[PDB]
Write a protein that binds this DNA or RNA. Structure first.
Lengths: 516, 329, 490, 136
DNA sequence: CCCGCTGCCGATTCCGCTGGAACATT
DNA sequence: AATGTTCCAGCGGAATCGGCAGCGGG
């Protein structure tokens, strides 16, 4: 297949009748890429990898030799598109050719004029910088001069399409994120650049905002904030502006479709809320309102990042209040009021029940600072409520095993803070842990991570008390093995045999360190 | 204090008589009249340019803008201004031979001129073809004003008729020659000859527009006709009064100043006095200056409502121009 | 359609009868056709340099085309005009070019007149552009390409109608065999000489039609009619130069930037402000601030009322008029109000007065919507369309005050002799034809430079006065004017 | 009124559905032959003509739908189909090829017609749907 | 939760006009 | 110095077109 079309694709470049040869070349490229993507056999797959990146013929040679010719722009586009796919199907096994590809992308960006060709080149370069995060190749990617070039592009070029300003800004951020050692001396300027452009796009009183530029600048700022922390501890000038812009980008403005600015803004929030902290207590009411209403937005990708942002927000405010939970007791009262109001509310939104109870458990910590007894009231209210619903309520006549991980995480969070365990709810707590080990298969994937985290957090919680409770770990593990070994092995549900639990323990006893 | 703000009356006999442009009417090649063209009604622009000064030091000399012409090589292999010749798009290609060549072979105007190309009797020169950016008025030359009486005779021969003059006018050697019309005029304090440019054949454009008279989809109902008649009468801006049996000019837009430079002046003043305060609002006398008096609006609401409720559905509105400042607050 | 480029295929006859000059030494009709096509290329290369043009030869001996019919030679597949193609046709001028034509492909053969039409159809059908008009100019003198066959004639008529239904309009200009149109061909069926214009009618022009503004004429509270603001007259000017690299003749890709705050380092558009130094003190404010202090209204027209056409005196001109015409697609029913206003304003001789704002952030400027009545006749003289004319109104300082301290009249007898002279020189102004000498000369010099032929033509300045003509056509009365009351007196 | 909405080109389920139904009706009246067949055939050809030179895509969509059940209508329009064939890319070129497939038999040459429209190259275009039609 | 179309709406490219700033001349 | 020309920069119309949402089926 390949190298039959690849040679023909080379010879179409010298053939007369350009823009007629270009159509044949585009078809050759499409068929070749389609053959390459679908082949899954490491021998043939490696042969195709070598042929595609050949030095005499091959895709990159065609791209560099068809670069002073408008007729082939589509072909170039296609090739770059295909490579973004091929780099995804592949992995670090593009590493030998990476620098080659990198150069090609750069060259295209500086010689092709169509944004429909600049965009795929920048996308491929971003995905290269993302694939080889930590590798020997990063020093070979001349990151310093790459930044010099693209940061020149921000000034020494006038009015790019803004579908390429988005990518340029995002790439400038990614340069700070990956291989930051070579960005050390030029990140400050980059920060200014972001703080410049963002400002315009969000504070112009004369011009309609460029949403793609906003998304790109927020993504780049998010990447840059790794390795280059701008905390209120040492930077109470820049960090406050970062927070103001994120707040503007996530708050409910006029009803906007094309959810790309709120999404990136609150992803930045979810990743760096700790970085800008003091501002986070100065807006807790409005922040909580906005984050909640975003969590219910029903958009498949906005809801996910909104939930992550809410988690980080609650975690950060709990940590901040816990340090000084005496003059922030108003905020404690507010958050307990809100969580209780959610719980008392008869909704079918299990998501908001989960976040409510988990924030309740999070704030259990600082509550013991003001009373030292409400922590004892919790883990009794919580244990009793959790026993009444996952331990006797409609053994199979319901579907509310969805919020068992959140309840169990809440219990783990609570009991870490109280001394003198009430010693009579120990059996019921053991029973909850055993049953969630039992109900691991019943969950969907990406919902199995959260319950393993819940189980391990419980295990860590009651392993730090004393040997007397460390015996409960022995009993609960023994019971879980009893349950999963006692299963038959050769509007409908399924039945687990033993397989569904493997990853469970594979996560518990090996893969907590990167998770705990 | 109402009209003094409304008009430029507060400025008077301060601005000098602008400029006399000396030339000569040439009819054929024998008659010649020594003439002084005074530039007249003409678009006005602010005479100061916002200067780019770098922030946090406010110094113009602290920044220099450069302009390099590199190349389209794999790297930006710069070339020098001495290595650059201007070309011209001709079909699908670009023609070299930049500047000295076209300096040699460019059209030469043979100096300034105000020669006459003949005369046009009727409304062959109708105002929708005036094409200039300025309007000149030619009077005369003094110092044995034979020229002045000759041009008075010419003006009276032009205006006692409906006749007008087509003129070949050129400012100087370098100026591109132009062809225009020469109005007779009717003034008693003075008598001029008013000149406006006039299109070349590759200037004017033929566009085809579907007719409205012979339209059945958009035939207007006579109720609509009389509603519009009522609106027009209720919204008139001219009147006959003071027992003179002549028409007056209410709301003379030809008298108020340009609000652009006035509001710029006030903004500069405010930012000079109060460097921290933000943009001021637009003065209310400015808005009152750019609006018809209240009586016409009061006369107009009722016919306006008649047309609103009587003409067909003013239906489709799906557009917006929301600003960043208002979309993020 | 707006982006519909026009197409034109040149189909010339090379059979036997155009390589002999009917016993004359004036011009062989083949050379006449080549002259015509040269003229059309040089015209549309500066008038419509986006239209597609093609040259196809039939009746030749050897063949070239995508179908490989015999005796059909496509010299140029249809594409934008260029200097290369004008030169490629120029190599067939005159008798030397005639023999060159003879030797490259060679005339004399049995063409079909149905394969050639098929080739033209394929040419039209092989381009990937939106075409507004498909037209084929047939350059031939023969009357009966079917002199010995009727099946051939029927096939030709069939394929002609087969072209016509797909919107391909064949038009025929016949190279007069005896030099005058008395050869009356019966083929009014196939087609849908008028050729001197095609040799030279339009030295230079342009083509377009576009809104230039889509606004809302609002009746001051909510009654809004969408409307287009067209530009009837524009003052075209020569194309801008292109910076081109000496050694290779390539565009040079300029890039401008500001830097060096006494250090050397790129300045982003955010770290600079705008200042004006007045007197001694310097006023500073930022770019969006200096963009927003000129902002009064939203784009559109708002009625200030109505004034009769009489009291707006027609020497208050500073900006060429525009043309209001109703646009319904933005808000429906606008054309009804527009027609009502047009009719009523015409009957009352009253023009509307509006506050015009073309772009989003630009000061308002007063305009007068003067109604104009569409004029037309049996000949269909569509020379002004119905609608409004935006006369731009000066404010107070766009006007200027002049000396005015001069008032001397002339006796009511020089007026008579000036009347004599003016009625002597009275002439109809024009319909067209005063083309810009500078622009025309630029086009001619550019033609010469691109085709590097002999040296550039001299555009005949229609703008110059026929000085000797006036002098002779007045005769002995201008001197009578010169010395009637005012001798030099020395 | 039946054929009119085939000019209501905003929803496929309106004009395309009307074209489908029109093809069925016209094949029926042809089969149970009666003197309403030519009148309807010409009437439908009228809107097809009105689409042929102003909206090529809707023209070919409607023509494909009609010729799904009534091939012999295509005979008037195969000239336009061939003239439009080089200008289509994607599913529309496939629709054009199906239309020309409907009447392959009886066409006098169809090989100069195809090779002229560069049939060999379009066959190598990478698409299982179109390749199959080319082989048919 | 997926999966798939399919409206449709946003942005690009291409023009073109206007405005503002810089030029060169008497 | 007054002005006209050239040049650069910015806005909008129009066509295209791709993918972003949301909406049904699986």
């Amino acid at each position: 297949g390949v190298r039959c079309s690849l040679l023909r694709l080379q010879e179409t470049l010298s053939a007369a009748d350009r823009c007629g040869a270009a159509l044949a070349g585009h078809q050759l490229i499409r068929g070749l890429g389609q053959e390459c993507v679908l082949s899954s056999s490491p021998a043939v797959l490696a042969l195709q990898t070598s042929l595609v990146f050949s030095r005499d013929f091959g895709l990159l040679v065609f791209v560099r030799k068809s670069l002073n010719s408008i007729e082939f722009r589509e072909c170039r586009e296609e090739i770059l598109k295909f490579l973004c796919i091929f780099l995804e199907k592949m992995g670090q096994k593009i590493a030998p050719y990476s620098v080659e590809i990198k150069n090609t992308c750069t060259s295209v960006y500086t010689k092709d004029r169509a944004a429909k060709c600049k965009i795929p080149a920048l996308d491929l370069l971003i995905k290269l910088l993302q694939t080889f995060r930590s590798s020997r190749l990063m020093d070979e990617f001349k990151i310093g001069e790459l930044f010099s070039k693209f940061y020149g592009e921000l000034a020494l070029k006038k009015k790019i399409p803004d579908t390429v300003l988005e990518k340029v800004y995002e790439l400038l951020g990614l340069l700070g994120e990956v291989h930051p050692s070579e960005m050390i001396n030029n990140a400050e300027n980059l920060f200014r650049a972001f703080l410049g452009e963002l400002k315009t796009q969000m504070t112009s009183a004369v011009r309609e905002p460029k949403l793609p530029v906003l998304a790109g600048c927020l993504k780049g700022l998010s990447s840059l904030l790794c390795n280059f922390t701008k905390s209120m501890e040492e930077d109470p000038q820049t960090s406050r502006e970062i927070f103001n812009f994120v707040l503007k980008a996530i708050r409910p403005q006029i009803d906007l479709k094309r959810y790309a600015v709120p999404s990136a803004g609150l992803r930045l929030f979810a990743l760096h809320a700790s970085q800008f902290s003091t501002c986070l207590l100065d807006n807790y009411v409005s922040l909580f309102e906005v984050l909640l209403k975003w969590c219910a937005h029903t958009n498949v990708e906005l809801k996910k990042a909104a939930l992550s942002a809410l988690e980080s927000f609650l975690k950060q405010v709990s940590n901040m209040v816990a340090k000084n939970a005496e003059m922030h007791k108003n905020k404690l009262q507010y958050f307990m009021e809100q969580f209780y109001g959610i719980i008392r509310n008869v909704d079918s939104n299990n998501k908001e029940l989960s976040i409510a109870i988990r924030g309740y458990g999070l704030f259990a910590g600082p509550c013991k600072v003001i009373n030292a007894k409400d922590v004892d009231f919790m883990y009794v209210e919580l244990i009793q409520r959790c026993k009444q619903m996952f331990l006797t309520q409609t053994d199979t006549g319901d579907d509310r095993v969805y919020q068992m991980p959140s309840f169990l995480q809440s219990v783990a969070s609570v009991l870490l803070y109280l001394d003198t365990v009430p010693e009579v709810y120990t059996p019921v707590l053991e029973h909850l842990v055993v049953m969630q080990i039992d109900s691991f298969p019943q969950y969907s994937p990406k919902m199995q991570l959260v319950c393993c985290r819940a189980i391990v957090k419980v295990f860590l919680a009651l392993a730090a008390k004393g040997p007397v409770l460390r015996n409960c770990i022995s009993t609960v593990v023994h019971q879980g093995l009893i349950r999963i070994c006692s299963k038959p092995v050769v509007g409908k549900w399924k039945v687990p045999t033993y397989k569904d639990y493997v990853d469970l323990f594979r996560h518990l006893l090996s893969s907590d360190q990167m998770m705990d | 204090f109402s009209e003094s703000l409304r008009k430029l009356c507060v400025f008077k006999k301060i601005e000098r008589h602008s400029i006399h442009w000396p030339c000569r009417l040439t009819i054929g090649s024998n008659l010649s009249i020594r003439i002084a063209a005074y530039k007249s009604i003409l678009q006005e622009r602010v005479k100061k340019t916002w200067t780019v000064v770098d922030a946090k030091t406010l110094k113009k000399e602290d920044i220099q803008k450069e302009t390099v012409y590199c190349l389209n090589d794999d790297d930006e292999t710069e070339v020098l201004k001495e290595d650059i010749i201007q070309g011209f798009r001709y079909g699908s290609d670009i023609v070299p031979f930049s500047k000295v060549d076209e300096e040699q072979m460019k059209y030469k105007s043979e100096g300034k001129c105000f020669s006459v190309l003949g005369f046009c009797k009727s409304s062959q020169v109708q105002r929708r073809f005036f094409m200039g950016n300025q309007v000149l008025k030619v009077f005369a030359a003094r110092d044995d004003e034979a020229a002045a009486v000759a041009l008075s005779s010419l003006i009276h021969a032009l205006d006692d008729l409906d006749m007008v003059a087509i003129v070949r006018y050129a400012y100087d050697k370098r100026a591109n020659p132009q062809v225009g019309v020469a109005f007779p005029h009717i003034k008693h304090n003075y008598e001029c000859l008013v000149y406006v440019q006039l299109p070349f054949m590759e200037d004017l454009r033929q566009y085809m527009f579907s007719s409205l008279k012979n339209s059945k989809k958009y035939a207007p109902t006579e109720a609509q006709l009389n509603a519009v008649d009522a609106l027009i009468d209720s919204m008139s801006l001219a009147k006959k009064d003071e027992k003179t049996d002549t028409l007056e000019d209410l709301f003379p837009t030809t008298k108020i100043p340009n609000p652009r430079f006035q509001r710029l002046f006030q903004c500069l003043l405010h930012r000079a006095l109060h460097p921290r305060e933000p943009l001021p609002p637009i003065q209310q006398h400015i808005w009152n200056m750019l609006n018809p008096p209240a009586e016409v609006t009061t006369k107009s609401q009722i016919p306006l409502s008649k047309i609103k409720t009587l003409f067909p559905l003013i239906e489709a509105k799906k557009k917006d121009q929301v600003t960043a400042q208002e979309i993020f607050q | 359609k707006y982006s519909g480029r026009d197409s034109l295929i040149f189909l010339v006859d090379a059979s036997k009868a155009m390589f002999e000059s009917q016993s004359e030494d004036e011009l062989t009709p083949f050379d006449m056709s080549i002259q015509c096509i040269q003229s059309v290329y040089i015209s549309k290369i500066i008038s419509s340099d986006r239209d597609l043009l093609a040259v196809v030869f039939y009746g030749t001996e050897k063949d070239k085309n995508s179908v490989n019919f015999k005796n059909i030679y496509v010299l140029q597949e249809l594409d934008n005009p260029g200097a290369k193609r004008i030169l490629e046709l120029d190599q067939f001028k005159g008798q030397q070019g005639q023999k060159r034509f003879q030797d490259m492909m060679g005339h004399g053969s049995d063409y079909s007149l149905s394969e050639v039409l098929w080739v033209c159809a394929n040419l039209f059908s092989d381009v990937q552009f939106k075409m507004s008009h498909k037209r084929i100019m047939l350059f031939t003198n023969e009357d009966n390409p079917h002199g010995n066959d009727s099946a051939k004639a029927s096939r030709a008529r069939t394929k002609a109608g087969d072209l016509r239904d797909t919107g391909i309009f064949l038009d025929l200009m016949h190279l007069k065999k005896p030099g005058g149109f008395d050869i009356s061909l019966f083929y009014r069926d196939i087609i849908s000489s008028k050729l001197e214009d095609l040799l030279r009618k339009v030295r230079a022009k342009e083509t377009r039609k576009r809104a230039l503004s889509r606004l809302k004429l609002k009746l001051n509270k909510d009654i809004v009619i969408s409307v287009g603001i067209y530009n009837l007259v524009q003052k075209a000017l020569k194309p801008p130069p292109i910076k081109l690299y000496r050694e290779t003749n390539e565009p040079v890709k300029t890039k401008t930037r500001t830097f060096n705050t006494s250090t050397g380092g790129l300045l982003l558009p955010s770290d600079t402000k705008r200042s004006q130094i007045y007197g001694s003190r310097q006023i500073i404010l930022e770019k969006e601030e200096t963009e927003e202090l000129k902002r009064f209204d939203d784009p559109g027209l708002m009625l200030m009322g109505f004034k009769p056409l009489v009291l707006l005196k027609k020497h208050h001109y500073l900006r060429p008029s525009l043309f209001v015409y109703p646009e319904e697609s933005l808000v429906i029913g606008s054309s009804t109000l527009f027609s009502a206003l047009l009719i009523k304003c015409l009957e009352k001789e009253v023009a509307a007065l509006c506050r015009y704002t073309p772009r989003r952030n630009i000061p308002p400027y007063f305009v007068a919507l003067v109604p104009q009545e569409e004029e037309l006749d049996d000949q269909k003289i569509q020379v002004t369309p119905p609608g409004f004319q935006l006369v731009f109104l000066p404010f107070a300082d766009d006007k200027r005050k002049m000396p005015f301290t001069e008032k001397i009249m002339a006796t009511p007898e020089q007026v008579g002799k000036m009347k004599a002279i003016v009625e002597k020189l009275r002439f109809t102004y024009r319909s067209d034809s005063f083309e810009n000498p500078v622009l025309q000369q630029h086009f001619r010099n550019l033609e010469a430079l691109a085709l590097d032929l002999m040296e550039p033509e001299q555009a005949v300045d229609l703008t110059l006065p026929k000085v000797e003509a006036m002098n002779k056509r007045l005769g002995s009365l201008v001197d009578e004017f010169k010395e009637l009351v005012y001798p030099p007196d020395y | 009124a039946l054929v009119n909405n085939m000019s209501f080109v905003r929803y496929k389920e309106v004009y395309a559905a009307a074209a489908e139904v029109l093809g069925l009706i016209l094949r029926y009246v042809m089969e149970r032959k009666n003197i309403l067949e030519e009148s309807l055939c010409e009437l439908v050809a009228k809107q097809l003509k009105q689409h042929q030179n102003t909206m090529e895509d809707k023209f070919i969509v409607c023509l494909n739908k009609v010729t799904k059940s009534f091939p012999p209508l295509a005979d008037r329009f195969m000239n336009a189909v061939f003239f439009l064939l080089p200008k289509f890319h994607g599913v529309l070129k496939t629709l054009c090829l199906e239309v020309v497939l409907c009447r392959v038999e009886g066409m006098t040459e169809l090989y100069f017609q195809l090779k002229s429209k560069d049939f060999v190259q379009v066959m190598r275009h990478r698409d299982d749907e179109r390749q199959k039609v080319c082989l048919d």
